[PDB]
Design a protein around this ligand. Structure first.
Ligand SMILES: O=C(NO)c1ccccc1
Ligand SMILES: O=C(NO)c1ccccc1
Lengths: 216, 1042
């Protein structure tokens, strides 16, 4: 009834939520095979067809089981122009997936980097305090005992400590706003992939029109 | 005129990297710390003294130099004696790290910011705070687990020590013998008998060995060339060796035998030049080194080592348990699942965000569906709402399955879609404690894979993405005024028997036969027909009902079970309950089938527990280490952390250090991958805590790879766009540094821990020509008898490429080579050693005296390259009686690769893919994409090994019209026998590929990728038709011959 079409029948049934008829794997096994009840295999053997084969297919599925080909003239080189469009569009999809991935690693590198900063910071805050225990236990004297041979230099340590602390919190800050442009850049990369995806699928399908009906 | 004068305005080349991965270095932001560097040092006093010190300086060195310069700064007296102090700083993994092993150098600390801090050893159990060892070996801090909330993790960590403790006791049962079994397990083939073609090399089964010895002055060695039976065990070989030492005119025959007996058991056999050891009752030729020696035309070089001087080496492992150190509640605190009366409903609410254009997409929706791997009801999409801009729902999806039907391994799967999928996640409907999930959940979603166009993705990882900055998806699970539990095994068996007895007395009529002691004899053959079918041969629903009906008969053909289990309806509580009971006392089967039942088609705990029991009885430690890759991948498919298969493997890895080794690397290689990160970390943690001293050997390997990862990174990022010559100056300058000299010398090859890697012969180390700057490394073999095996071990470290496809084809190649060999057919493949140890990072065993066909042709360069150059080049190595062999070898190796590359469908074979050893063996390297990933652009497949003129000559000796020779007819017959041999073991390969769907390889994303291997072996056709398929397809590709 050619006037009706396993691996490639699974492939064409992909992206469908439907039925079609197929030849067997052995001649001696059975005749043909039919493929909404969750897509599964219905052997055409069910001495051939009880209704001459096609009369049973039009007829239909709970009636026996408990758990129950467009020609495409719709709209040579029309492969070459659409397939290079598909591949140059595919090239773009996988262009972004690389950028999508690398950015995601990069981002996660930045937040772990920040956790490092924050802890590093805390060890320097904790330090500037550690002297005020042991330094103003020995600010007891203040003005005498060889004047300020001790007390001038103690300040210099304190002075650097705090200005270093600042440079750390400046570097973290810079990182935090670096992560933001990235987070935004990441969301935007995801965005265009989602706009492409269905167009990329249609080009693969609209290729599949003239795919069956040198260059590539 | 060329381009009809058309300008491309978009186009510009200032920075376009198609012309001419991507683990931070020794400090944050910089790969290689400057040779002098400035380190702020914080003390108990608040002074931050900024020392310069050397990149490579120890913490001791900086300590005693911060001891002296602290005298020059204020407030000295209150700073204690330095011996009462330790360093600590924040690392790049962002953790405060006390630095105990102060032999460690500044570069080797992974320091983030160049600063130290002094404190005292808080927590005087300092021996314990060498978890650092483990966290370094694992590649994440152990304390990162302690802070995990989820009690499944905390339970796993504590519960899995059962297996640790047990395995360590089993090591020390017959010690110190059994500790040397653990450490040096004997390396022996699976079949004790040899194949015929190996036997024939021996004259009625006798090998010439050579035992060696050493005695005072101790720098002298002594050959003792025996001629004993291949099948005599090492004891006897030690005996005959001692007979010759002593045999004398002054010993009688009787005195001799007494002097034998005493001297026998005090010695054991070791392979010269590497740390293999013959430690049990095994026929000499069952050991792999011997059967290897036979084949190559070599004379075994063993050694008589004293058991004293072996048991000298093996250290006391002494495992210690960490800080993580029938109902007494009257029956039914909880409600059994089978009591509940309702359909399943689940509340979708809100997706915190989705990244989509408001223009380009029309509308979006949460799609859902309940699963067992494949689906038990219609997918329940939710209505469209706030499409592409602030999307929340608040609906209750109603799933047509009544709650007591839900199978144990049942899972919600979900995604968000467009008028194509946006982001996905799955959830186990049952928690690890058997408890049916209730309340609200916060399911962060995973980005869709690349090629995956399917909306829902139920083969993806179950659980929420541990990156909180993703599409969150809040949802509620119906609550039945009580905590619900999966029914106890008692309860299920009861209900089985009821449905069994309720079967017996049903109507004369039942929709005909439908899904139900008639022992039909045509039917009794239709089972065996279906039994033997290949796993991927999809079954018809008629055949399911057929199989399902004679289920009780199927137990006599135990091998049918995979086909039976698929046919069972899992959304029928009744059907499943009987199946569970069959499986309870079903009889065990071959590990090659049991493996099938640990793929994604089989999620059920009962089914999978059976499979573990088949393996527990019938899988040998040889066949385990053969299929170790697939078993590690299959851990992913498990629902929960603690389970039968992890316990099995962890035990076997702790039994056997050669398993343990690759089991550690295989987990470690995928440690970067956040979907397995936790599961595998926790497993890696348990292994490191139990494995004993090997942890310290693994740390040397791990610490080595880091240096090499870091070196190549610098080479690939800065020293790119500089001539090889400057890069080679840089390479060697870097390797001579003392931190490298420490780190890259004196450790075990991870390609084979048997081999030791001594000192780095830098004269031979070099950066290869490839763009990815692979390092050719070369080490002295520090073995005492290195002379007899190899003076120099050289292996390739490659930072660019994803090795794990190669890894798998090399695996499959071996398994072909072994199937052939044992079946009689001798086709010598060379499955060189390759090991993925990280995200596109690994090791590759070199093969000395082998060159690409292209290189051969440049040695025979004089306009046009002659096809005879190969044949001439091969004759120039092999002359005389030799020559006929070198052809045989080439012919045998060519046939093997012809069949294997055809079947697997690996990347097209040109001259720089294919290599020839001086001895005449041909082998393929760099396989690329296995199952034809290069048909996503662009029936009847391809022959990827196309036998040029060049090859045909060599097969047929120096010849004209070379397709008509008998040499070529014999070559053809090898290919026919080989192609059929593999086909008769096709299940194994179908399963082995299926088990690897869990690894994120773009070539194995679903069962329809593994389609190819069915078509190429042509299993749907008969064998004679497949023969003629192969001949057809081999004729097509060479334009005649076949
Ligand atoms: O689950 C059941 N409960 O009655 C059931 C379903 C179908 C057929 C027989 C029984
Ligand atoms: O370099 C080559 N190796 O096969 C080559 C490439 C193209 C054509 C002929 C030879």
């Amino acid at each position: 009834l050619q006037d009706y079409w396993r691996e490639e029948v699974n492939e064409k049934l992909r992206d469908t939520a439907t039925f079609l008829v197929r030849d067997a794997s052995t001649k001696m096994h059975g005749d043909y095979t039919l493929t909404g009840g969750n897509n599964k295999l219905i052997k055409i053997f069910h001495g051939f067809s009880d209704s001459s084969v096609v009369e049973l297919i039009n007829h239909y599925l709970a009636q026996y089981n408990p758990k129950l080909s467009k020609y495409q003239q719709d709209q040579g080189k029309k492969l070459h122009e659409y397939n290079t469009q598909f591949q140059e569009k595919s090239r773009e999809y996988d262009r972004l997936y690389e950028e999508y991935t690398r950015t995601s690693q990069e981002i996660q590198m930045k937040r772990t980097a920040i956790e490092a900063f924050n802890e590093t910071i805390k060890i320097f805050e904790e330090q500037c305090q550690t002297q005020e225990r042991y330094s103003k236990e020995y600010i007891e004297k203040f003005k005498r005992e060889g004047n300020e041979k001790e007390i001038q230099r103690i300040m210099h340590n304190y002075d650097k400590l705090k200005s270093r602390i600042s440079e750390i919190i400046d570097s973290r800050r810079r990182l935090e706003e670096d992560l933001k442009k990235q987070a935004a850049e990441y969301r935007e990369i995801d965005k265009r992939m989602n706009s492409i995806k269905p167009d990329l699928i249609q080009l693969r399908k609209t290729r599949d029109q003239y795919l069956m009906w040198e260059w590539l | 005129s060329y381009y009809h004068h058309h300008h491309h305005h978009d186009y510009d080349i200032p920075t376009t990297q198609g012309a001419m991965p991507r683990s931070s270095g020794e400090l944050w932001g910089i790969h290689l710390m400057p040779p002098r560097i400035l380190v702020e040092c914080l003390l108990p006093n608040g002074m931050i003294v900024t020392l310069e010190c050397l990149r490579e300086a120890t913490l001791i060195t900086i300590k005693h130099e911060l001891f002296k310069e602290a005298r020059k700064y204020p407030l000295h007296q209150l700073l204690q004696d330095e011996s009462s102090y330790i360093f600590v700083s924040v690392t790049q993994e962002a953790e405060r790290e006390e630095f105990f092993d102060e032999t460690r150098r500044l570069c080797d600390l992974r320091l983030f910011q160049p600063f130290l801090k002094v404190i005292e050893p808080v927590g005087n159990r300092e021996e314990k705070i060498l978890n650092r060892e483990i966290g370094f070996a694992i590649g994440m801090p152990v304390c990162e687990f302690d802070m995990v909330k989820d009690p499944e993790v905390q339970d796993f960590r504590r519960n899995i020590l059962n297996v640790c403790k047990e395995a360590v006791d089993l090591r020390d049962l017959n010690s110190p013998h059994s500790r040397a079994m653990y450490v040096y397990p004997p390396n022996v083939e699976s079949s004790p008998e040899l194949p015929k073609h190996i036997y024939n090399k021996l004259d009625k089964g006798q090998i010439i060995v050579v035992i060696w010895v050493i005695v005072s002055p101790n720098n002298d060695k002594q050959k003792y060339t025996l001629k004993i039976n291949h099948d005599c065990v090492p004891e006897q070989v030690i005996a005959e060796a001692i007979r010759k030492k002593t045999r004398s005119m002054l010993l009688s025959s009787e005195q001799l035998k007494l002097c034998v007996l005493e001297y026998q058991g005090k010695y054991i056999l070791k392979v010269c030049g590497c740390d293999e050891y013959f430690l049990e009752k095994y026929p000499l030729s069952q050991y792999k080194y011997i059967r290897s020696c036979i084949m190559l035309g070599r004379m075994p070089n063993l050694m008589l080592m004293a058991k004293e001087s072996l048991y000298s080496q093996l250290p006391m492992d002494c495992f210690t348990m960490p800080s993580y150190s029938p109902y007494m509640n009257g029956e039914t605190s909880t409600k059994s699942l089978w009591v509940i009366n309702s359909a399943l409903r689940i509340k979708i609410l809100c997706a915190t965000y989705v990244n989509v254009n408001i223009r380009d997409i029309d509308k979006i929706y949460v799609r859902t569906g309940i699963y067992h791997g494949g689906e038990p009801l219609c997918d329940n999409v939710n209505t469209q709402r706030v499409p592409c801009s602030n999307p929340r729902w608040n609906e209750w999806l109603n799933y047509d399955i009544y709650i007591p039907d839900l199978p144990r391994a049942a899972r919600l799967c979900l995604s968000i879609c467009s008028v194509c999928p946006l982001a996905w996640g799955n959830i186990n409907l049952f928690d690890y404690t058997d408890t049916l999930v209730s309340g609200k959940m916060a399911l962060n979603l995973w980005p869709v894979p690349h090629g995956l166009e399917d909306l829902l993705n139920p083969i993806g990882v179950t659980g929420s993405n541990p990156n909180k900055e993703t599409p969150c998806l809040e949802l509620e699970f119906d609550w039945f005024s009580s905590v619900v539990k999966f029914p106890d095994m008692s309860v299920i068996e009861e209900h089985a028997n009821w449905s069994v007895s309720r079967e017996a007395g049903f109507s004369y009529s039942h929709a005909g036969l439908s899904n139900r002691n008639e022992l039909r004899e045509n039917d009794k053959e239709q089972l065996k027909a279906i039994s033997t079918r290949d796993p991927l041969s999809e079954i018809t629903e008629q055949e399911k009902d057929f199989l399902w009906s004679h289920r009780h008969y199927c137990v006599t053909i135990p091998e049918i079970l995979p086909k039976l289990l698929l046919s069972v309806k899992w959304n029928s509580r009744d059907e499943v309950a009987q199946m569970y009971c069959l499986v309870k006392d079903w009889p065990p089967i071959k590990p090659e089938q049991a493996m099938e039942l640990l793929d994604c088609n089989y999620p059920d705990p009962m089914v999978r527990g059976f499979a573990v029991r088949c393996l527990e009885k019938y899988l040998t430690d040889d066949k385990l280490s053969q299929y170790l890759i697939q078993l590690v991948q299959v851990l992913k498919y498990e629902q929960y952390l603690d389970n039968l298969l992890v316990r099995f493997l962890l035990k076997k890895a702790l039994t056997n250090q050669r398993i343990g080794h690759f089991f550690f690397w295989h987990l470690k290689s995928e440690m970067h991958n956040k979907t397995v990160s936790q599961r595998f970390g926790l497993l890696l943690e348990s292994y490191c805590r139990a494995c004993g001293m090997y942890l310290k050997h693994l740390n040397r390997q791990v610490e080595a790879m880091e240096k090499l990862i870091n070196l190549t990174d610098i080479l690939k990022q800065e020293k790119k766009d500089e001539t090889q010559k400057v890069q080679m100056k840089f390479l060697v300058e870097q390797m001579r540094r003392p931190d490298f000299m420490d780190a890259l010398q004196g450790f075990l090859s991870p390609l084979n821990p048997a081999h030791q890697l001594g000192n780095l012969r830098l004269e031979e180390c070099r950066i290869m020509s490839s763009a990815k700057r692979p390092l050719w490394l070369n080490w002295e073999n520090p073995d005492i008898m290195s002379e007899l095996l190899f003076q120099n071990n050289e292996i390739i470290f490659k930072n660019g490429d994803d090795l794990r496809q190669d890894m798998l084809t090399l695996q499959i190649i071996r398994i072909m080579e072994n199937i052939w060999q044992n079946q009689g057919l001798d086709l010598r493949m060379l499955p060189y050693g390759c090991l993925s140890i990280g995200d596109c990072v690994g090791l590759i065993e070199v093969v000395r005296n082998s060159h690409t066909i292209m290189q051969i042709q440049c040695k025979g360069g004089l306009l046009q390259f002659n096809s005879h150059t190969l044949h001439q080049w091969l004759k120039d190595k092999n002359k005389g009686e030799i020559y006929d062999a070198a052809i045989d070898l080439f012919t045998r190796s060519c046939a093997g690769y012809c069949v294997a590359t055809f079947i697997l469908g690996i990347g097209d074979r040109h001259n720089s893919n294919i290599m020839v050893k001086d001895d005449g063996q041909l082998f393929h390297i760099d396989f690329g994409h296995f199952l034809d990933h290069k048909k996503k652009k662009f029936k009847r497949e391809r022959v990827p090994f196309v036998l040029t003129q060049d090859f045909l000559i060599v097969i047929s000796k120096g010849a004209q019209e070379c397709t008509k020779t008998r040499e070529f007819e014999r070559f053809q017959e090898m290919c026919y026998k080989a192609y059929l041999a593999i086909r008769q073991h096709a299940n194994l390969f179908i399963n082995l590929f299926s088990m690897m769907l869990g690894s994120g390889m773009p070539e194995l994303q679903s069962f329809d990728d593994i389609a190819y291997i069915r078509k190429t072996l042509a299993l749907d056709k008969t064998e004679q038709e497949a023969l003629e398929y192969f001949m057809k397809q081999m004729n097509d590709a060479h334009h005649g011959g076949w």
